[PDB]
Write a protein that binds this ligand. Sequence first.
Ligand SMILES: COc1ccc(C2(C(=O)N3CCC[C@@H]3C(=O)Nc3cccc4[nH]ncc34)CCCC2)cc1
Ligand SMILES: [Zn+2]
Ligand SMILES: [Zn+2]
Ligand SMILES: [Zn+2]
Length: 441
Amino acid sequence: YCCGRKLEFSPQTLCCYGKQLCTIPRDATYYSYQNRYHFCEKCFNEIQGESVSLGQTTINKEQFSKRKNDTLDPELFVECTECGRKMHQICVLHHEIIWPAGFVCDGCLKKSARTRKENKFSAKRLPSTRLGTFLENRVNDFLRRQNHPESGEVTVRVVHASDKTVEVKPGMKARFVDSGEMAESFPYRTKALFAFEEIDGVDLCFFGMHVQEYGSDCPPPNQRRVYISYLDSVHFFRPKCLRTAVYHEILIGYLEYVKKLGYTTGHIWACPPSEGDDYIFHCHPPDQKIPKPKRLQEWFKKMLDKAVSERIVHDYKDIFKQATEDRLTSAKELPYFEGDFWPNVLEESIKESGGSGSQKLYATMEKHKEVFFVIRLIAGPAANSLPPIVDPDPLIPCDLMDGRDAFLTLARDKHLEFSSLRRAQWSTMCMLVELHTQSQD
Ligand SMILES: COc1ccc(C2(C(=O)N3CCC[C@@H]3C(=O)Nc3cccc4[nH]ncc34)CCCC2)cc1
Ligand SMILES: [Zn+2]
Ligand SMILES: [Zn+2]
Ligand SMILES: [Zn+2]
């Protein structure tokens, strides 16, 4: 081999199909049918009977194969078209679409005074936006002030933007929508953006984020609000000593930008994802740990405190204090975001109380206050006389980046891990190719 290392891809984590939020981890015993419907051992033996509803066809348990999630797929090699030398495709970052003529190794390149043809499928050449330019300018200006020899050029690209609506769930709908007290749905625009760092002339995707933006056309209570759906990272930014600062620069810049457009309030649900290796990026580095809730909360506070000192954020409060200042009385006054905690808990509260949308509201808000940040961007008289929000950036149709599920599925299907610098660089290269090609159609 090339680098003298025997390399294989790790067994991934699978869903178990007989419980929402159930997964089959690596090396665990499980049952599968047609390599499509997998069941963890516990969920399988708990099914009363030997019949399993799937899809809705009923399948017998003897048709299932008993397996352990221990399959190690070896890494692929590519062969130099001149040396015959076999090298890991990931080590040399050879992509057939980028260099269709074939793989020529570095040694054969030097022995002809030759360089690889320019990678036109780069992060920088992804279409720009006013938002992405604003963010990457902030990050790169910050990095240049640090004068650290290891920092590379950072690219920020918005890769998806589409119109969506969040639907009020049945319990809140029956309580408040059917009475005409609350809009049935709330229109918003979702945006997905990613940050890339050039390391040794090679792109590395190290940050990703999806947001929901509710414009001046949105009925209350969601008007002029932005909400972070999810944020994720791969911890290989160089230098490490500027990693946290760069994340904060992106988030503060996003808040600064939406404030300029006229959004008044930002919302953050500071809740770590469940333990696992996939959130936005597939197969995180094993030594990158998910922060515990208190540390994640302090991390967001540190970011927002800097935003306050920069006069970008006027102030921020937890949901409980914010409700108290706003003199809230009913759950219909709480902003209603897609996939957020509050729509789910309000369904429970109405059911538990026998049909009230106010009973446990303040107690529930106090119980979870430290997890929910309400960020005031525009305050005072200015927040009441604002012009309509007009976004100069166009819609970006990209089904791979409409939500986080599609990109995870592509990475799983093509072994695109972010578990090491070399694999993350390869997964970044493949991800950029997909983004450049899907758009060309
Ligand atoms: C205080 O410590 C912190 C605070 C914030 C972060 C950020 C960050 O990446 N995260 C906040 C929670 C989600 C994501 C994260 O840690 N994801 C994962 C890491 C490892 C394995 C994983 N599996 N699944 C997801 C996942 C970094 C930028 C955005 C916030 C990281 C550490
Ligand atoms: Zn190698
Ligand atoms: Zn299960
Ligand atoms: Zn060669």
